[PDB]
Design an enzyme around this catalytic site. Structure first.
Site, PDB file in Angstrom:
ATOM      1  N   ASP A 138       0.834  -1.198   0.000  1.00 54.20           N
ATOM      2  CA  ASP A 138       0.000   0.000   0.000  1.00 54.20           C
ATOM      3  C   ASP A 138       0.871   1.251   0.000  1.00 54.20           C
ATOM      4  O   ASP A 138       0.564   2.239   0.678  1.00 54.20           O
ATOM      5  CB  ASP A 138      -0.957   0.014   1.196  1.00 54.20           C
ATOM      6  CG  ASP A 138      -2.081   1.029   1.040  1.00 54.20           C
ATOM      7  OD1 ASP A 138      -2.316   1.495  -0.095  1.00 54.20           O
ATOM      8  OD2 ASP A 138      -2.719   1.370   2.059  1.00 54.20           O
ATOM      9  N   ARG A 142      -0.092   9.099   0.573  1.00 56.03           N
ATOM     10  CA  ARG A 142      -0.911   9.165   1.781  1.00 56.03           C
ATOM     11  C   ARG A 142      -0.316   8.340   2.915  1.00 56.03           C
ATOM     12  O   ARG A 142      -0.562   8.638   4.089  1.00 56.03           O
ATOM     13  CB  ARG A 142      -2.336   8.694   1.487  1.00 56.03           C
ATOM     14  CG  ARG A 142      -2.438   7.215   1.154  1.00 56.03           C
ATOM     15  CD  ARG A 142      -3.860   6.806   0.821  1.00 56.03           C
ATOM     16  NE  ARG A 142      -3.926   5.407   0.415  1.00 56.03           N
ATOM     17  CZ  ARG A 142      -3.818   4.990  -0.838  1.00 56.03           C
ATOM     18  NH1 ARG A 142      -3.666   5.841  -1.839  1.00 56.03           N
ATOM     19  NH2 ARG A 142      -3.861   3.686  -1.094  1.00 56.03           N
ATOM     20  N   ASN A 143       0.456   7.302   2.592  1.00 50.65           N
ATOM     21  CA  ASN A 143       1.087   6.450   3.593  1.00 50.65           C
ATOM     22  C   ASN A 143       2.565   6.774   3.774  1.00 50.65           C
ATOM     23  O   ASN A 143       3.353   5.905   4.161  1.00 50.65           O
ATOM     24  CB  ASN A 143       0.896   4.978   3.230  1.00 50.65           C
ATOM     25  CG  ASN A 143      -0.518   4.501   3.487  1.00 50.65           C
ATOM     26  OD1 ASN A 143      -1.233   5.067   4.312  1.00 50.65           O
ATOM     27  ND2 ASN A 143      -0.931   3.460   2.775  1.00 50.65           N
ATOM     28  N   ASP A 156       1.972   2.096   7.396  1.00 45.66           N
ATOM     29  CA  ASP A 156       0.852   1.270   6.931  1.00 45.66           C
ATOM     30  C   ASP A 156       1.309   0.200   5.941  1.00 45.66           C
ATOM     31  O   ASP A 156       0.677  -0.027   4.908  1.00 45.66           O
ATOM     32  CB  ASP A 156      -0.263   2.126   6.325  1.00 45.66           C
ATOM     33  CG  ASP A 156      -0.985   2.967   7.361  1.00 45.66           C
ATOM     34  OD1 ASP A 156      -0.743   2.768   8.569  1.00 45.66           O
ATOM     35  OD2 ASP A 156      -1.813   3.814   6.967  1.00 45.66           O
TER      36      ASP A 156
HETATM   37  C1  LIG Z   1     -10.467 -12.251   9.956  1.00 47.80           C
HETATM   38  N1  LIG Z   1      -9.732 -11.044  10.400  1.00 47.80           N
HETATM   39  C2  LIG Z   1      -9.479 -10.231   9.145  1.00 47.80           C
HETATM   40  C3  LIG Z   1      -8.842  -8.950   9.603  1.00 47.80           C
HETATM   41  C4  LIG Z   1      -8.180  -8.954  11.041  1.00 47.80           C
HETATM   42  C5  LIG Z   1      -6.997  -7.923  11.238  1.00 47.80           C
HETATM   43  C6  LIG Z   1      -7.247  -6.568  11.547  1.00 47.80           C
HETATM   44  C7  LIG Z   1      -6.197  -5.638  11.738  1.00 47.80           C
HETATM   45  C8  LIG Z   1      -4.827  -5.990  11.661  1.00 47.80           C
HETATM   46  C9  LIG Z   1      -3.681  -4.900  11.859  1.00 47.80           C
HETATM   47  C10 LIG Z   1      -2.524  -5.138  12.676  1.00 47.80           C
HETATM   48  C11 LIG Z   1      -1.497  -4.163  12.835  1.00 47.80           C
HETATM   49  C12 LIG Z   1      -1.581  -2.900  12.172  1.00 47.80           C
HETATM   50  C13 LIG Z   1      -2.687  -2.640  11.371  1.00 47.80           C
HETATM   51  C14 LIG Z   1      -3.698  -3.630  11.224  1.00 47.80           C
HETATM   52  C15 LIG Z   1      -2.499  -1.194  10.782  1.00 47.80           C
HETATM   53  O1  LIG Z   1      -3.264  -0.604  10.031  1.00 47.80           O
HETATM   54  N2  LIG Z   1      -1.291  -0.612  11.229  1.00 47.80           N
HETATM   55  C16 LIG Z   1      -0.630   0.739  10.979  1.00 47.80           C
HETATM   56  C17 LIG Z   1       0.995   0.657  10.933  1.00 47.80           C
HETATM   57  C18 LIG Z   1       1.687  -0.233  10.058  1.00 47.80           C
HETATM   58  C19 LIG Z   1       3.098  -0.274  10.050  1.00 47.80           C
HETATM   59  C20 LIG Z   1       3.852   0.563  10.895  1.00 47.80           C
HETATM   60  C21 LIG Z   1       3.165   1.438  11.752  1.00 47.80           C
HETATM   61  F1  LIG Z   1       3.853   2.238  12.560  1.00 47.80           F
HETATM   62  C22 LIG Z   1       1.758   1.488  11.768  1.00 47.80           C
HETATM   63  C23 LIG Z   1      -1.087   1.858  12.030  1.00 47.80           C
HETATM   64  N3  LIG Z   1      -1.518   3.177  11.688  1.00 47.80           N
HETATM   65  C24 LIG Z   1      -1.847   3.875  12.889  1.00 47.80           C
HETATM   66  C25 LIG Z   1      -2.322   5.197  13.168  1.00 47.80           C
HETATM   67  C26 LIG Z   1      -2.540   5.576  14.475  1.00 47.80           C
HETATM   68  C27 LIG Z   1      -2.290   4.656  15.554  1.00 47.80           C
HETATM   69  C28 LIG Z   1      -1.830   3.379  15.298  1.00 47.80           C
HETATM   70  C29 LIG Z   1      -1.598   2.967  13.939  1.00 47.80           C
HETATM   71  N4  LIG Z   1      -1.123   1.720  13.362  1.00 47.80           N
HETATM   72  C30 LIG Z   1      -0.641  -1.633  12.147  1.00 47.80           C
HETATM   73  C31 LIG Z   1      -4.590  -7.357  11.342  1.00 47.80           C
HETATM   74  C32 LIG Z   1      -5.637  -8.296  11.151  1.00 47.80           C
HETATM   75  C33 LIG Z   1      -7.677 -10.366  11.462  1.00 47.80           C
HETATM   76  C34 LIG Z   1      -8.396 -11.550  10.914  1.00 47.80           C
HETATM   77  N1  LIG Z   2       0.873   8.306  13.255  1.00 51.29           N
HETATM   78  C1  LIG Z   2       0.116   9.196  12.624  1.00 51.29           C
HETATM   79  N2  LIG Z   2       0.293  10.510  12.895  1.00 51.29           N
HETATM   80  C2  LIG Z   2      -0.473  11.402  12.258  1.00 51.29           C
HETATM   81  N3  LIG Z   2      -1.429  11.202  11.356  1.00 51.29           N
HETATM   82  C3  LIG Z   2      -1.579   9.893  11.112  1.00 51.29           C
HETATM   83  C4  LIG Z   2      -0.872   8.858  11.681  1.00 51.29           C
HETATM   84  N4  LIG Z   2      -1.315   7.645  11.174  1.00 51.29           N
HETATM   85  C5  LIG Z   2      -2.262   7.965  10.325  1.00 51.29           C
HETATM   86  N5  LIG Z   2      -2.464   9.314  10.246  1.00 51.29           N
HETATM   87  C6  LIG Z   2      -3.424  10.016   9.413  1.00 51.29           C
HETATM   88  O1  LIG Z   2      -4.710   9.540   9.726  1.00 51.29           O
HETATM   89  C7  LIG Z   2      -5.543   9.532   8.538  1.00 51.29           C
HETATM   90  C8  LIG Z   2      -6.143   8.160   8.361  1.00 51.29           C
HETATM   91  O2  LIG Z   2      -5.087   7.206   8.119  1.00 51.29           O
HETATM   92  P1  LIG Z   2      -5.472   5.779   7.517  1.00 51.29           P
HETATM   93  O3  LIG Z   2      -6.627   5.218   8.269  1.00 51.29           O
HETATM   94  O4  LIG Z   2      -4.242   4.954   7.383  1.00 51.29           O
HETATM   95  O5  LIG Z   2      -5.958   6.203   6.059  1.00 51.29           O
HETATM   96  P2  LIG Z   2      -5.210   6.240   4.655  1.00 51.29           P
HETATM   97  O6  LIG Z   2      -3.750   6.197   4.992  1.00 51.29           O
HETATM   98  O7  LIG Z   2      -5.747   7.454   3.965  1.00 51.29           O
HETATM   99  N6  LIG Z   2      -5.695   4.864   3.959  1.00 51.29           N
HETATM  100  P3  LIG Z   2      -4.763   3.552   3.758  1.00 51.29           P
HETATM  101  O8  LIG Z   2      -4.160   3.583   2.387  1.00 51.29           O
HETATM  102  O9  LIG Z   2      -5.581   2.308   3.914  1.00 51.29           O
HETATM  103  O10 LIG Z   2      -3.676   3.508   4.789  1.00 51.29           O
HETATM  104  C9  LIG Z   2      -4.644  10.023   7.396  1.00 51.29           C
HETATM  105  O11 LIG Z   2      -4.843  11.408   7.154  1.00 51.29           O
HETATM  106  C10 LIG Z   2      -3.235   9.747   7.925  1.00 51.29           C
HETATM  107  O12 LIG Z   2      -2.266  10.604   7.366  1.00 51.29           O
HETATM  108 MG   LIG Z   3      -2.146   5.561   6.077  1.00 49.03          MG
END
Ligand SMILES: CN1CCC(c2ccc(-c3ccc4c(c3)C(=O)N([C@H](c3cccc(F)c3)c3nc5ccccc5[nH]3)C4)cc2)CC1
Ligand SMILES: Nc1ncnc2c1ncn2[C@@H]1O[C@H](COP(=O)(O)OP(=O)(O)NP(=O)(O)O)[C@@H](O)[C@H]1O
Ligand SMILES: [Mg+2]
Length: 292
Positions: A138, A142-143, A156
């Protein structure tokens, strides 16, 4: 290493303000209140879309430990998890937001030096993920999160639909490799050089595979020289093994970053803000103390 993912209680953090949503859940600006203390530490919180079962939470934790184990200046690390009915994930809050919104809001004030350095940093992070044998799946502007204007980090990753960022073999055959990430990197670079334009704007996603098979690609951004555009076009070759490697992308963009105005043609480029030593040291001490 289990010690890299903190299991949080619902009672030790609070959601404060919504920031956005994407595909897996909603992102909030939050506060972590260390127990026994009087401080409020800002965090980012992602609450999942649907509640989950103890079994699906095990699948969550297994991937969460992997995302908590990354250690690279240009790759975001997952910090914590709260195993509520709807699971809540916690990472570092980036007050500058994502790179896509940053370039859109600063589209009239971003110089060639920052753009090429962002490309270098994104490739450095992507090269790390490949070294860890982690496919992003992904990658997009945006990520890419902005920690400081001089320091971006990819986020992400590893969350196994962004059709317009996917390689053709991902659209046609759900094939995700590090070479399909290179395609997404090419589209991500295109977003930066167009200052946040939507790729294939107006074209229905159901037709993207059709236009790619017949040979059409994203157009040359107006600020791009042919040297930069050919890099983006090489990321979009049908043969995945013909696309450049991230380590090659690091070298090539580093070369162009040494002389930015020969490869990017931006109005007012000589008048845009360069990263000063005084500004970079100030940014580091307040917001960005990591190794680099
Ligand atoms: C049947 N069922 C289907 C789905 C289900 C499931 C659901 C969710 C995750 C899962 C598990 C773990 C992560 C994510 C998502 C997910 O979206 N993550 C981001 C991420 C990825 C990499 C580095 C990083 F710093 C952050 C992320 N964005 C954030 C924004 C604000 C606060 C916390 C955040 N965390 C980490 C795995 C399985 C399991 C089985
Ligand atoms: N750690 C973080 N600090 C600040 N903003 C964040 C952080 N993580 C996510 N965001 C913001 O939160 C909003 C939602 O993030 P997210 O749910 O990952 O949507 P997305 O990145 O637009 N979709 P996807 O491609 O699935 O990851 C976006 O505007 C991100 O930039
Ligand atoms: Mg994102």
């Amino acid at each position: 290493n289990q010690a890299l993912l903190r299991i949080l209680k619902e009672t030790e953090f609070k959601k404060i303000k919504v920031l956005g949503s994407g595909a897996f859940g909603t992102v909030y600006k939050g506060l972590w209140i260390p127990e026994g203390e009087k401080v409020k530490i800002p965090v980012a919180i992602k609450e999942l879309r649907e509640a989950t079962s103890p079994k699906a939470n095990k699948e969550i934790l297994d991937e969460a430990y992997v995302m908590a184990s990354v250690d690279n200046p240009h790759v975001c690390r997952l910090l914590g998890i709260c195993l509520t009915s709807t699971v809540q994930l916690i990472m570092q809050l980036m007050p500058f937001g994502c790179l896509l919104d940053y370039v859109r809001e600063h589209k009239d004030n971003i110089g060639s030096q920052y753009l090429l350095n962002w490309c270098v940093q994104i490739a450095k992070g992507m090269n790390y993920l490949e070294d860890r044998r982690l496919v992003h799946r992904d990658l997009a502007a945006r990520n890419v999160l902005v920690k400081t204007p001089q320091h971006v980090k990819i986020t992400d990753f590893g969350l196994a639909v962004p059709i317009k960022w996917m390689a053709l073999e991902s659209i046609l055959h759900r094939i995700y490799t590090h070479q399909s990430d290179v395609w997404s990197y090419g589209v991500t670079v295109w977003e930066l050089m167009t200052f946040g334009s939507k790729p294939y704007d107006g074209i229905p996603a159901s037709e993207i595979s059709s236009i790619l098979e017949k040979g059409e690609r994203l157009p040359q951004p107006p600020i791009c020289t042919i040297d930069v555009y050919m890099i983006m076009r090489k990321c979009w070759m049908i043969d995945a093994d013909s696309r450049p490697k991230f380590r090659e992308l690091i070298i090539e963009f580093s070369k162009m970053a040494r002389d930015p105005q020969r490869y990017l043609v931006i109005q007012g480029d000589e008048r845009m803000h360069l990263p000063s030593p005084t500004d970079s040291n100030f940014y580091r001490a307040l917001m960005d103390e990591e190794d680099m």
